[PDB]
């Protein structure tokens, strides 16, 4: 199965506005193989990654992840995003971290313009435990049992500057895929769309 | 301790005139603070010495124009004339080419090592000036962001003590 697991696929697509404010939190990512928020309308069908489709068959997994971020700017937009990772559980409240107090944790910087349209990024495996459960079957929230090794946040590192005559805001896709993955304990779980 | 930290940021506008100081910053006094986990190391130590390394970043849209100047001056500018700041270690932010600079200084100071609870005077003042004013088109964003980074090097410590509390 390494094949499906090793190939980046779409995950979530967020807008980024010129009106955005410095130090704001644009979007928050629970970090699992199991997250896809994207969806389509007609025909009626719902996005699911490659990866998300495999691990949703398994009870457990561990390994690196690869977030490849791809931005579609002009040449003439300019700005910097930021990636700040925050280990923990999935339910820890990160909403109260400033821009500063985020950067303390491991982070990466990125520039919008360039001949470089993609940032490979690799979250090293950080856990108390050798694995993570797939919780979503078991409904209510049981203490200590965790899926996402932590949230990932995208701040707005600078405002978004641009001449007057071009599009005012830049979308960015979020790819997803893994490497050195290992999993076991099969099962059948239809994973319904994580929304928000 | 060796890692980077976001420190201070300010936006840069047109209305700033020549040598209107956009940024008067202090390296040390800002690091020591509640907001970081590097705070931990110092707050339990009386004496520390170290080297500094700085990053500075902006993102002028190439239709904008202007330039900025980053000088690392120990003590203060005092009455040292503006003109000569390039004497100090420095780089030149230029809308045209470089969007980034990196400055590295080792330790310079008049005593053995810095002391946090009772700093004599700030070691490294970080000054930034308007080197060539920002002139803009029409409809272009008339502002642009500016950010700063830092990290210690060869950080050494001495003198554990609770008295910080």
């Amino acid at each position, epitope marked *: 199965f390494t094949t499906w697991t090793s190939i980046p696929t779409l995950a979530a697509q967020f807008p980024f506005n*010129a*009106s955005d*404010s*410095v*130090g*704001q*939190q644009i*979007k*928050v990512i629970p970090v699992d193989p199991y997250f896809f928020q994207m969806t389509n309308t007609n025909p009626d069908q719902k996005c699911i990654t490659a990866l998300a489709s495999i691990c949703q068959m398994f009870c457990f997994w561990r390994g690196d992840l690869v977030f490849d971020f791809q931005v579609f700017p002009t040449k003439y937009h300019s700005g910097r995003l930021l990636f700040c990772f925050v280990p923990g559980n999935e*339910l820890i*409240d*990160v*909403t*109260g*971290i*400033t*821009l*500063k107090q985020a950067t303390t944790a491991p982070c990466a910087v990125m520039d919008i313009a360039g001949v470089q349209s993609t940032l490979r990024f690799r979250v090293p495996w950080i856990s108390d435990t050798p694995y993570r459960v797939n919780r979503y079957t078991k409904e209510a929230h049981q203490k200590g049992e965790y899926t996402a090794i932590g949230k990932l946040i995208v701040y707005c590192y600078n405002r978004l500057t641009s001449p007057s005559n071009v599009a005012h805001h830049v979308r960015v896709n979020v790819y997803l895929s893994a490497i050195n993955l290992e999993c076991f304990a099969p099962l059948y779980h239809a994973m319904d769309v994580t929304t*928000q | 301790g060796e890692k980077f930290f*976001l420190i*201070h*940021s*300010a*936006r840069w*506008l*047109t*209305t700033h005139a020549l040598f209107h100081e956009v940024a008067k910053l202090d390296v040390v006094k800002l690091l020591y603070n509640e*907001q970081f986990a590097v705070q931990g190391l110092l707050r339990y130590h009386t004496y520390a010495r170290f080297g500094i390394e700085i990053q500075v970043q902006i993102n002028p849209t190439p239709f904008q124009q202007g330039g900025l100047i980053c000088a690392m001056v120990p003590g203060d500018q005092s009455y040292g004339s503006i003109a000569s700041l390039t004497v100090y270690p420095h780089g030149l932010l230029n809308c045209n080419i470089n969007n980034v600079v990196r400055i590295k200084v080792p330790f310079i100071y008049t005593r053995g090592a810095y002391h946090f609870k009772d700093p004599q005077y700030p070691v490294w003042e970080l000054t930034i000036r308007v080197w060539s004013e920002l002139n803009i088109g029409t409809g272009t964003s*008339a*502002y642009t962001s500016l950010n700063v980074l830092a990290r210690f090097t060869d950080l050494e410590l001495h003198g554990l003590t609770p008295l910080s509390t």
Partner: antibody
Amino acid sequence: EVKLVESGGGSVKPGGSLKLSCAASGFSFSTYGMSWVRQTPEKRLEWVATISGGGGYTYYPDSVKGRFTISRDNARNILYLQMSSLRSGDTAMYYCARRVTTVAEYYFDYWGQGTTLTVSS
Amino acid sequence: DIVLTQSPAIMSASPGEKVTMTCSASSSVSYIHWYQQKSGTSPKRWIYDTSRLAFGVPGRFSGSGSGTSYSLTISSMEAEDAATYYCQQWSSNYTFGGGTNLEIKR
């Protein structure tokens, strides 16, 4: 476009209770802490509450401390401000405001129209 | 129990002149945010952090000050600015300024 809609409220006699609701739209709600802020008729303002991203933590100023309740269901992107044992000094305009983040501090962005609580009998 | 003051309560200014208003503190405060309220309208994003700007604002506004002292400054008065301007601190116990009425002169 951000849309904040305050609901409920009116004249209430001292000792009565009330709960208010802010409707949110146009942004992922769970990702932003929320808050209520009071406006006295004097065009003076005061900060009555905040709740964090999830259920998380809740913050109160001293004056109303223990007398008020704040709560969230992100499923509907709607708030609840639960008050009880109100007295006359509470009459004011109340707003809901999404709390966001800057470099070192917290800052309010969008404010709804707000409803009017009147404590008197 | 940490409070702000705004020196002018009410100030009138004509179009084409410089304007100054000052929020002062009962202690030292790192940053101060400003809000703007127009009649029958909820106050809005105005000037956050210290001298940084909101998006929608025109670029003729400025601010400065440090420690206990901070000041909001308007380069050249224009008619569309009439409002009340509130200040704020996030230091400890969240607190607002008493407001400063800006008024057109004629």
